[PDB]
């Protein structure tokens, strides 16, 4: 991610430059095919659109400073250099499906605008998110 943190500056500076052009060009140019005055949707959502790229770019930049030369980031690396452990990946879980079902229940709750359905769907969602996180933590059954 040495180069990943860098390539975000491209879009960041581009969108920052376009946002400032947009604000100044929309509030001071009368075209005849529109009216004069700053547009408050293309300005806020394009200033803050550059914000996303800047955030991710800066975070990855700070992160990449304090990382050693990884084999994946090394041009002439042997396959045997990463020989070790790649951390912990969940093999299986039923909870993603359940919590999709829970968001579906809340969705229809909001559609029909039934208070009980919204309330149940909200707490049916908290439960499933909780169970997703506590999946590998459920203690050995104490008698």
């Amino acid at each position: 991610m040495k180069s990943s943190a860098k390539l975000m500056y491209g879009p960041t500076v581009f969108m920052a430059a376009m946002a400032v052009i947009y604000i100044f060009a929309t509030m001071h140019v009368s075209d005849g095919g529109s009216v004069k005055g700053v547009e408050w949707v293309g300005s806020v959502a394009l200033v803050l659109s550059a914000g996303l790229t800047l955030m991710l770019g800066v975070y990855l930049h700070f992160t990449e400073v304090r990382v050693d030369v990884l084999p994946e980031d090394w041009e002439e690396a042997e396959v045997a250099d990463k020989a070790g452990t790649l951390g912990f990946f969940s093999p299986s879980s039923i909870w993603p499906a359940a919590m999709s079902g829970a968001v579906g229940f809340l969705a229809f709750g909001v559609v029909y605008f039934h208070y009980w359905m919204i309330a149940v769907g909200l707490m049916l969602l908290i439960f499933t998110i909780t169970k997703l996180n506590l999946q590998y933590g459920v203690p050995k059954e104490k008698h």
């Binding site: 991610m1 180069s3 990943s4 390539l7 975000m8 491209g10 879009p11 581009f14 969108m15 376009m18 052009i21 947009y22 060009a25 140019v29 075209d31 095919g33 529109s34 009216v35 547009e39 949707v41 293309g42 959502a45 394009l46 996303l52 790229t53 991710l56 990855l60 084999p71 994946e72 980031d73 090394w74 041009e75 002439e76 690396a77 042997e78 396959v79 045997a80 250099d81 990463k82 790649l86 990946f89 969940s90 093999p91 299986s92 879980s93 039923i94 993603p96 499906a97 919590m99 999709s100 079902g101 968001v103 579906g104 969705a107 229809f108 909001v110 559609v111 029909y112 605008f113 997703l132």
Partner: protein, 573 residues
């Protein structure tokens, strides 16, 4: 240096896992409910996408049948209006966006040399939320009133508590919101696997064009989908409660239009870059030539990343509320990187050895289509030309050369290409060619003359027209060829079903012969962890050098235009 390992006696082979023909009872039922394997998830993610394709395309036929002749033969105004709303929605958000992540879930971990995705339980949630959103959105048809009937853009104040009442319009909003969570849940872990989980020696610039495209799309989908969710939840807040945010008396119409099109065109380009990548995978393998201008492609894709954000109000030239010069010019720019990456394809095929299998046929039948689609795109990008063409029927023809271009031709190309990888079996060539020719003639027939009618004064969302308009012969031709386009899926479905359980067995880890991507260095299908062994990655084509060692010196010596004089340079320390 290279550190040649000692020849160990006894090493025979990996297990070479069995193809998909032989499955026992219960082997898949509960596995799919709880799976966190990106392979099976991707398979079911593509299948579901195509199911929605067939379902959403049936609506297009009903629309197209009604337009055969003047007068309302079987369909009403209300039913016709809610039939293009749901057709344009199911095809863009229930087939388009998912099919993007299906090719992402399957081959992106396989292309960078990863064992799995970063968040296996999260993309498993991304599949289940999208399907739920889809089912929720379509529940509108099961209400007496019907589904949403405002288009796929839900303009204001046509889409408020006053106008368009009924629960279908809420279902549409909520379903769109839910399917948009699946896109961001998938973009999170298509972006962090690229960063973190990569094979030894696979630098960022060793990754294929496909993964670069999904990289750019991921960062591009993170800033558009939340915005749509915010806008749609603003409308729901207006409808369900008594909010006044979207009243015409304070923007409202224009507010929504800006808010929508700001994600309207970024979602459009989330449907194009991955399929440009798919095509960028297929062309080099069938031409026995490397991807011409690899870094050129990188820069082109990166340009479309940033430029696509500054062009959103070119969708609203006739509103008389936007700065015409700003959006007109910005749109003219976004054609330049596309032109670049489009010349790169020609460069790749240039003086190559082309074998015409189904993937290459599809890919070439793509460029010819999307080219004309994009050509009539710069037409609409000029306001003097867009005044006549906006909200009209020439527009309809335009975004069917680009949508049916990318998301259909390149998607099908990807299916034929990766089928041996995904299943260990190969698709029938004759049936594939039949499918291509049907879906090609049947498409150009139904959409070419569509241009002509739009210019002579037929607007888009019209249930009916008069005989004294001249739009009779054209509608007739379009309907005939559309019914032909609808039949093209018959060979496709038969091919996929038959070849899944009876297709020819793949006995080599690279059936297409000259594959140059990390997926072609593994068994078909891969063994549950993507790799029973990992090669040395020294370029963007690690599988090619793996299979063809005798030419490793040839592909370096003549890769550049000339003045290449490093083969005679002294060694470093």
């Amino acid at each position: 240096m290279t550190a040649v390992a000692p020849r160990v006696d006894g090493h025979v082979a990996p297990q070479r896992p069995e193809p998909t023909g032989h499955a026992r009872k219960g082997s898949k039922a509960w596995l799919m409910m709880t799976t966190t394997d990106h392979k099976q998830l991707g398979i079911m993610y593509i299948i579901m996408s195509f199911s929605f394709f067939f379902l959403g395309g049936l609506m297009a036929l009903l629309i197209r049948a009604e337009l055969f002749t003047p007068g309302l033969q079987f369909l009403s105004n209300e039913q016709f209006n809610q039939l293009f709303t749901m057709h344009g929605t199911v095809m863009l958000l229930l087939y388009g966006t998912p099919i993007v992540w299906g090719f992402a879930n399957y081959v992106l971990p396989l292309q960078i040399g990863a064992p799995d995705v970063a968040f296996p339980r999260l993309n498993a949630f991304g599949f289940w939320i999208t399907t739920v959103g889809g089912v929720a959105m379509l529940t509108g048809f099961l209400t007496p009133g019907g589904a949403a009937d405002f288009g796929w853009t839900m303009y204001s104040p046509l889409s408020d508590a006053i106008h368009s009442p009924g629960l279908g319009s809420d279902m549409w909003i909520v379903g769109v919101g839910a399917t948009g969570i699946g896109s961001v849940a998938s973009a999170i872990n298509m972006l962090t696997t690229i960063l973190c989980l990569r094979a030894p020696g696979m630098t960022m610039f060793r990754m294929p064009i496909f993964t670069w495209n999904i990289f750019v799309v991921s960062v591009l989908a993170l800033l558009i989908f939340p915005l749509l969710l915010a806008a749609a939840l603003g409308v729901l807040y207006d409808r369900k409660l008594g909010g006044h945010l979207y009243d015409p008396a304070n923007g409202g119409s224009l507010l929504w239009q800006h808010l929508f099109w700001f994600f309207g065109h970024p979602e459009v380009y989330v449907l194009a870059l991955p399929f440009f990548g798919i095509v960028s995978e297929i062309i080099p393998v069938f031409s026995r030539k490397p991807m011409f201008g690899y870094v050129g492609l990188i820069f082109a894709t990166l340009s479309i990343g940033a430029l696509s954000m500054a062009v959103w109000a070119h969708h609203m030239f006739v509103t008389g509320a936007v700065l015409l010069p700003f959006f007109s010019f910005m749109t003219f720019l976004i054609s330049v990187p596309t032109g670049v990456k489009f010349f790169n394809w020609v460069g790749t095929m240039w003086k190559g050895h082309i074998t015409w299998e189904t993937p290459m046929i599809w890919s070439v039948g793509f460029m010819a289509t999307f080219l004309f689609g994009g050509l009539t795109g710069i037409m609409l990008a000029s306001p003097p030309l867009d005044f006549h063409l906006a909200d009209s029927y020439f527009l309809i023809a335009h975004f069917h050369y680009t949508l049916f271009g990318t998301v259909v031709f390149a998607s099908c190309a990807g299916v034929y290409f990766w089928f041996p990888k995904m299943t260990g079996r190969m698709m029938d060539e004759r049936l594939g060619k039949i499918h291509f020719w049907l879906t090609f003639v049947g498409f150009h027939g139904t959409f070419l003359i569509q241009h002509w009618v739009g210019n002579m004064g037929m607007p888009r969302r019209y249930a009916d027209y008069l005989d004294s308009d001249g739009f009779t012969i054209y509608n007739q031709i379009s309907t005939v060829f559309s019914f032909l386009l609808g039949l093209s899926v018959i060979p496709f479905i038969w091919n996929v079903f038959k070849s899944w359980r009876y297709g020819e067995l793949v006995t080599v880890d690279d059936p297409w012969g000259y594959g140059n991507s990390l997926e072609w260095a593994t068994s078909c299908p891969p063994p549950r962890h993507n790799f029973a062994s990992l090669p040395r990655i020294r370029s963007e084509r690690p599988a090619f050098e793996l299979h063809y060692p005798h030419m490793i010196e040839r592909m370096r010596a003549e890769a550049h235009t000339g003045h290449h004089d490093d083969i005679n340079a002294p060694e470093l320390g």
